[PDB]
Amino acid sequence: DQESSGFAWWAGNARLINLSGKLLGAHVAHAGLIVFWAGAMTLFELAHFIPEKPMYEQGLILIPHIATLGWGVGPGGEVVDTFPFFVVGVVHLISSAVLGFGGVYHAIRGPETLEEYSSFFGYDWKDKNKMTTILGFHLIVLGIGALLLVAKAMFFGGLYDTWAPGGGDVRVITNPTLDPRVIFGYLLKSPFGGEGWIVSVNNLEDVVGGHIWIGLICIAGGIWHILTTPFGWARRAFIWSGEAYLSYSLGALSMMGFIATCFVWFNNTVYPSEFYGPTGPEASQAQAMTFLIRDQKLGANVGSAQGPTGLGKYLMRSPTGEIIFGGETMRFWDFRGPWLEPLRGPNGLDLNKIKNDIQPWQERRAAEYMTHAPLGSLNSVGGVATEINSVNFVSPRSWLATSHFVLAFFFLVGHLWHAGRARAAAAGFEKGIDRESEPVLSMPSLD
Amino acid sequence: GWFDILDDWLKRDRFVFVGWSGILLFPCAYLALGGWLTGTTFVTSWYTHGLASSYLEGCNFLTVAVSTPANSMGHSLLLLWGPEAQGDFTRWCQLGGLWTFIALHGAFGLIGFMLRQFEIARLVGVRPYNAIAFSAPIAVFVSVFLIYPLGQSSWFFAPSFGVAAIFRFLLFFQGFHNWTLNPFHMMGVAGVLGGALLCAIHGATVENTLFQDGEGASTFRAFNPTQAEETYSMVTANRFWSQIFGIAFSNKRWLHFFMLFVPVTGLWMSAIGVVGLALNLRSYDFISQEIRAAEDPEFETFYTKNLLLNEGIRAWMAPQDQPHENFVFPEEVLPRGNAL
Amino acid sequence: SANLWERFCNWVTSTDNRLYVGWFGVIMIPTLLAATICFVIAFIAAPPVDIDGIREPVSGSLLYGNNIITGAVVPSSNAIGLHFYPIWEAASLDEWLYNGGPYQLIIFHFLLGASCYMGRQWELSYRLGMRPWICVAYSAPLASAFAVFLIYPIGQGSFSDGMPLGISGTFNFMIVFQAEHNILMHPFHQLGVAGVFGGALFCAMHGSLVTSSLIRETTETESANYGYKFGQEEETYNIVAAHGYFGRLIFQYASFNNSRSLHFFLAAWRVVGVWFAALGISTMAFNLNGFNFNHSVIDAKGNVINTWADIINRANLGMEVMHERNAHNFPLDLA
C-alpha cells in the first residue's frame, strides 16, 4: 500500500516512524546475511588453500583471520591441518541458515507494530530511554565478545604470536597487561610517523591485556544505559530523530573503516605478516636488507660505504641519531618486526651484529618480503606498475586497505547525508522551505 | 512543389526526428560509430603499428582501437579506390584505411549534427545556444584529429580510436610536447574543471534550495512541468553563499549563460594550443631557467625534474612507438636514474 | 538578561553577518588564515627545500626561481617521514625551512580548515531552514583534496610524495604516479573523467538550453540577460518550451520532462565520479593500481604481440627510471 502514502521508491526503504516489525526483522535479516558471507567465503577459502603455500599467495583474507587466534597455526605460521578452519566456515553457513530462518519472518508475517503486540520489544524513537537502554544492552553483548579473546588467548589456545622467542608460534598469553596508564596511554597519544594511535602495538599482551579493559567498560556501559535515562546536558544537541540515530551510530564506522584501513596496512602484530602480507614498510626494508647482505658478502663494507648521493649507500642516520637503512627506504625507519629486531642495536642498527651475526634464515624471510611487496594491479598482477605478466599475487594488506577505505569514506559522506537532513526534521525544512514563509525574506539583507 | 514534398515528410515529428540534417548526420554518424565498432573487434593494425587491435586478436576493450595508418602513408585520404588499396576492402583495411574513414565521416557526422540542432531550434523555434555551444567539441575534434596530423608528419601520430589508444596520446604530448606547460591547455583544464564544478555547484545548489510544493518527503512529484513558477527562490539560496563563499548570484538568466561559457569557452582554448602543436610550435621550455640551470649544478625546480621525465618518456618510448623510423637505442645510450 | 557568552554564541550563529562565522568557522577561519598567509609568503621567498631524502635542495620559488609556473611550496623530506614536523622542532627556523617545515604547517591547516568549510558549509543549511545537502556535494571536493594531501602520504612512506602545492609540482606529482601506478589504465580515474568529462559536456547544455529558452523582455534595445529581475517567483525561462527542443534533438523520453530530474542530477554526474577518482587515488595509496596488460596479448610460438597498453608502458618505464633519479640505491621502488 506504499509508494503513494510512503515517500519514495529507491528510498522506498526506510518506512519507520515509532516502530516496525518489518525493519526489526530486516536488520536481523541482513545481520544474518552478513553471517552467510563469513562462512560461505570461509568454506570457499579452505576449499582452496594449497597443501603448503604462502597463506597470502592465494586470495585468503578470512582464513588468515582465523589463524591469528590460533587455529591451524603451526610453529612459524604453517597450517597444521585444514580443519579448525572448516569448523567456523560451516558453523557460519548453518549460522547463516539460522539468520535466514527468522528474518524473512519479521519481514513478511511478523507483527507490524511493536506496541499492539509486544510492549517491551516495542520502541518509539522520541522514546528517550527505550532507545537509551537497548544501547547498554548491545553494549553488553559486546562486553561479552570483548572477553572471548580474553580467554582464547588466556584459556583455549592463546593467540599466534609472531613476536615469539623462537619465531612465529601460537603461544598462550598468560600475563595480560593490566596497567591503567599503559593500556589507556595507547589511545591517548602518538598520531603520525612517531607511532600510530593504536595501530601502534608492540606485544600481544598489550592487546589481550587491554581487550580486557574493553570487555568491562562496554559491559559496565549497559549497567549505565540500561540503568539510566540521558543526563542533564546531552538532552540538548543530538536530534533524537529516528534517522539521526542511523547517523550518530553510522559516521562512527567511517572512523573505524579508516582506523581499520590503517591497521591492515601498518600493524605487524595483529596482522601477522605470515598470515597476510608483509606491511608496505616491511617490504621496503627487506629490499635494502637483501642487497645489503648480497653486497656485504661480496666483500663490501656497509658501515663505511658512502651513498651515490653522497648520503649513505646502505646506512644513514635518522633525525634521532639512530642507525637506519638508506636508499629511499629511509621513510620507513619506524618499522619494527621479528626478523630484524635481533639484527638491531641500542642506537639503531648495530654495526657488529649486522656484519656477522646476520644468521642464515633472516636472509630468505627478508627476501620473500622483497619479492612479495604490498603492490599489485587493478587486474591482479603483483609487481611494479610495468611488470610483465608473470607473478600475480596482490597483497591481502593491499585489498583490506583499499577495501575498507572506499567504504569507510562513503560512510563519512553517509554520516553527512543523514546527520544533516535529520537536523531538518526537528526543524521541518526537510522537503524544502515554505513557499510563503521563507526565513531569508524576513532578514535585514546585509546587502 | 516536390521540394516541399520531400521536406514535408523528412521533418515530420516522428519518435526520433529525422529531417534534412538526417541526410548528413545520420548516414555518416553511422559508418563512423560503425566503422569504429567493426574494426574494434575485427581488424588489426599490425601493418602500421605491429600491434594488436581487434578483440579477435585477444585485445581487451581498452587496448582495442582502429589505430591510425603507418606514418609511411602521409595524409593520403586512403580511399578504398585510391592508389593505396587500389580497391580492396581487405587491403584498404590492413592499410588502416578506416581511420580516415572513421574520422572524415565522424567529421561530417559532427557537421550534420550541429546543423541538426539548428534545424530543430529553428523549427520549435528557440535561441541557437545549443548549436552555438557545439563549437566546443567541433573545434576540439578538428584540432586533435584533423589539423594536428596535417601539421605534423603522417596521419600516424594522430589520435587512434581506442581508450588505451588515446591514453597513449596524452603521455605522447607529455613526452615530446610537454603539453601540461602550454598556457592554453591550462585553460582547457580550467574549463572542464570550473564547468564540472558549476554543473554541480548549481546542481546540488538547486536540489537543496527548492521548496515544499508537493506532499511527500520526495521531490519527484513537486510541481511542474512548467506550471507553478520556479521551484528554487534564488533569494534564499543567494544569501547563503554571500555569507559562505562570499559572492553569490542573482539573475539565473546569466547563471545559465555563464554556465554556457566556462566549458565551451576554455575547451576552445586548448584547441588553439593544439594547432600550435601541429607546428611543434609549443610551450616546452623557459629559457630564463635553462641558462640559469646550465651554469649551476645546484639549481633545481620541478620545472627541470618534470622536464626529465619527458626525456625518459621519450628515449624509452619512441623506438617501439615510431617503428617507421627504425630507432636503434643501445642499452647504454639509454638515460635512466641511479639504481633503476 | 543573558550573560555575555550567550551573546557571543548568537553572533557566531547570527544569520545576519556579511559572512557567517559559524561554529565550524571559529576553527576554519583562524585555520585557513594560517595556511594562506604562511604559503602566500613562502611562495615569494621559499628557501631551497629538499623534498626527497638526499641532501640536494630543490627549490622552485620566486626570489629563487622567480616564476609563477615554476615555483611552488615544496613537500616534506623523506628524512622526517610521515613524522609530524612542528616548526618548534627545527633547532632553527632555518632548519624547518630545509626540511620544508612550512609544507606541513600549511597543508594541515588547509586540510582541516576546508573540512571546516565542508562543515560550516551546512551551517546555513540549518541556521536557515533549507535542505542541508549542499555541503554534501562539497564532498566530491574536500575529500579528493585529502586523497592527494593526506591519504597517499599515509599510504606510501612519507609526505615526500604529496602533490606538492605548485603548478608544475602538480604535473610532476601527476607524472610520478602515472609511472608508479597505471592510474590512466584505471577504471577509477576513469570515473572522474566520467564526471569531469561530463559536468563539462553537461554544464554546456543546461547553460545552453536554459538561455536558448527565455521569454521576451528587451529586444536588443539592451541585453536579454535582464529578462529576470532578482526575487521574482516567476521563472524567466520556459521549461517544456526548453525540453521541447532536446526532446526533439534526441528522441523524446531522452530529454528531461521534470525540472527536478533536471539539475540535481546536474550534481549526480560530477560528485559521483569525482568521489571515485578521489578514491582511485586514495586507493593507489595502498597500491591497487590500474590494470596490467603488459604483454597480456601473446602469440602462437609465444612471440609477444603488443597491446596498445604496451606502448603506454614505455611512456611509464621511461619516467619510472628518470623519476627522482639518484634518490634510490636499490632496484625496486616500493614508494
Binding site: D447 | - | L19, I44, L62
Partner: peptide, 30 residues
C-alpha cells in the same frame, strides 16, 4: 621584476576580492 610582477598581479586579485565582497552592489528584490 619577474617576481615584482608576480607579487603585484597577485595583490590585486586580493584587492579585486575585497572589492566584490564588500563593494557588491546589493541585489534588489522587486
Amino acid at each position: 621584476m619577474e617576481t615584482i610582477t608576480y607579487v603585484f598581479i597577485f595583490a590585486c586579485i586580493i584587492a579585486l576580492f575585497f572589492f566584490a565582497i564588500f563593494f557588491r552592489e546589493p541585489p534588489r528584490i522587486t
